[PDB]
Symmetry: C3
Subunit: 320 residues, 3 copies
């Protein structure tokens, strides 16, 4: 299964329905396409949904719901994810694993083009996947549009013609930004499983999750904080795994939630501030869902750890 | 400039092709207009109600019917969810029931895209800076009987289209599609209150979403009006993403918007309407508003939340403990 | 409306997208099609959704929602159903009313082929429906794939050529099993209406419901238990009915939930174990949704009976 060929099905919908989605498609002088989903345009709920689905290599279903009840409790529009290709979609494609630095353009790149450039190499080793395709689709969290030199750099790294590169872009501080980041709820768990817990994510057979769409804050530092908090305080995840002899799934579940990290307990913006706006001072294990539920198909066991913390989410977003 | 009639026609064509699957009935009038019965002599269906509602929004919103996942003892009902990235155009340019249709003994409020050709009422279109241009007109009608040839001819003439290119969708208040389409007005009730009562410029609403329960169907048209209003006024949640300008007081828009800000809030609408001697004039029109309102001001990053979903009044309205 | 012809629309998507859905399509030498949705394959969320839609004869919408609000409350991925053909979809097709026993293959058969073989006959009389079709589509809750003899038995019972038989199969203990059993939340109430309450289910005009996907347990008895429990402690239903003079809809509503049954209150596995693993000692009225909501369109009345029991769901699932 090819993440670039599969994601191209959704890129084609985005391009055909650009006007309906409040996004803007441009062609660079070299033939690459840029799809502005939030820099100079508003984007839309559906554009955010489709952008997230392209980050996932087309190997997940993405929806926007309003979960929550007939009661006084706080509820928000939320992004739900379902995937039956959990390592490939979330780590082979969605993870923002490519540092894109060209002139004054700096952004983390996500999406299926990462599975042609193999960014980073160790992820593709561990999930035993690589793509083969003649087009490359990357999504970029950035406050400006990339130009011709960024497209050429991505083309060369992916081994494709630059006229076959497609770049989707939206700032952190946009609706599409809030949606795509909430849509990383499942990814934050599989990456913590792989990098921090040393759990083999090829064992995760199915996965789903949901996290709220953070309010959009025009300050990019504040938007980083509120969008991370959406996942960390508001996210729920469900992983269906096939354990093997010697695995300790109860420990994986207990270790996974954001609350197991050191420095947990404050809105991200405040954590990052306490840390001197420096990542060396931050436990990256904090980047994880609020709540983790794991069904081990090998034993029939169900584990539930963490919980959604509505008080900390409301603190983050500025409401009582 | 997007056309609400041409966009809604994509959904009308699915309703026509799938009419038997949807439990609705399409007829052709002798003057060539099309009538789509979604509840007068037919049962309609969940999907008919979804699609009816999408047509009322001009095709410029997504509409779903959710069955809530809530593993607790709390009361929960099937609900209508709305998402729109054209908020004033979809909800006010199309959805709002701004046309009083009175022809012989047929009387109903007309909603949907045809309003944006007949400009009903004029001030809405001036304030949202939108008018359609189309050679067909689609109107939905909350009525207990099917409209005939003269009603279609009147709508065609007011819309400046040929009557053969008129499409009328009809469902009683007291029907499944009536409860769905009125729950689907959850976002509209806030945008119209912003425009008409709070004098807020709704062209500043960039995105909007909302959800409201589907009221139980009561065969008494006056009781059905009360229960379906109550679904929004007590059960509706709304989410408005706005771009404020200097001098706006978004905190005050948020606080002023919910149904509970109105005088007379606090009883089922049937009882409010009766205590008021069944006359719309004795009613605070600010009462027609969502239960809960959340506003994200994109200009500042602020989040505001006002009002609340009132389960006790939904249960009282619907007759359950 | 033909439940076989309508379900074939979904079968065709399952066939075309088999690799994308982690299911396996095979053809037997006699030309029948077997679609393995969980025996030797993982299946998927979308396979389970489409399997459940095929069980309902294509006459319902099925979704998988990822509920999970902003609170400490337990929430699980759940299956939602909406239907405007409630007796035909849930009893004429979905109900697992056909005992399939051929050699050492034993399973209950669900889906549209039941409306050709008329299994059982009384259901088709009471709902006033029968199909007419030249293909037959059956779903089977089984731990092994059926072979040519099972396909030929189905073909002959349904009056079709075996080359036009389609069998979908998944074990109880699989993702598709958990999904398709949670998808029976509305059927559990319509069957109990017809069989236990003697209520005429042709009066149900619309219906919807939702139940959680149970955790998958590889023990088939424990899987039977946990997937039952998803509906009987976790399921909500909504029936829109048209009562007539003489009907007592308040009594229907009160008598329908799982909690009105004898032996209610323990996870099903434990109920069943106490019963000596014998369906004779079990009140089958316990196979009902946890919560029942009825709107009587003739009167405008709303009734709500039963309730979701999150503590017993948690007990059943071991958390």
């Amino acid at each position: 299964v090819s993440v670039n060929l599969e994601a191209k099905k959704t890129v084609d919908v985005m391009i055909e329905k650009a006007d309906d989605l409040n996004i803007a498609v441009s062609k660079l002088e070299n033939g690459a396409t840029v799809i502005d989903c939030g820099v100079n345009v508003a984007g839309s709920f559906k554009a955010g949904e489709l952008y997230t689905k392209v980050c996932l290599g087309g190997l997940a279903d993405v929806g926007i719901s309003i979960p929550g009840d007939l009661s006084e409790k706080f509820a928000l529009p939320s992004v739900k994810i379902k995937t039956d290709f959990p390592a490939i979609s979330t780590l082979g494609a969605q993870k923002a694993g490519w540092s894109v630095s060209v002139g004054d353009f700096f952004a983390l790149g996500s999406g299926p083009a990462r599975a042609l450039s193999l960014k980073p190499a160790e992820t593709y080793e561990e999930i035993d996947y690589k793509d083969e395709a003649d087009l490359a689709i990357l999504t970029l969290e950035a406050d400006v549009l990339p130009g011709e030199d960024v497209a050429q750099y991505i083309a060369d790294e992916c081994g494709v013609d630059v006229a076959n590169v497609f770049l989707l872009v939206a700032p952190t501080a946009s609706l599409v930004g809030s949606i795509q980041i909430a849509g990383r709820v499942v990814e934050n768990g599989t990456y913590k499983m792989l990098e921090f817990l040393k759990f083999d994510v090829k064992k995760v057979v199915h996965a789903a999750g949901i996290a709220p769409i953070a309010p959009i804050d025009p300050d990019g530092l504040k938007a980083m904080g509120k969008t991370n908090d959406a996942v960390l305080f508001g996210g729920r995840t469900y992983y269906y795994v096939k354990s093997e002899e010697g695995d300790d799934i109860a420990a994986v579940a207990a270790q996974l939630p954001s609350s197991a990290a050191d420095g947990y307990g404050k809105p991200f913006f405040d954590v990052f501030k306490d840390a001197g706006f420096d990542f060396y001072q931050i436990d990256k294990g904090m980047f994880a869902p609020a709540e983790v539920v794991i069904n081990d198909l090998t034993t029939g066991k169900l584990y539930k750890e963490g919980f959604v913390n509505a008080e900390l989410l409301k603190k983050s977003f500025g409401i009582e």
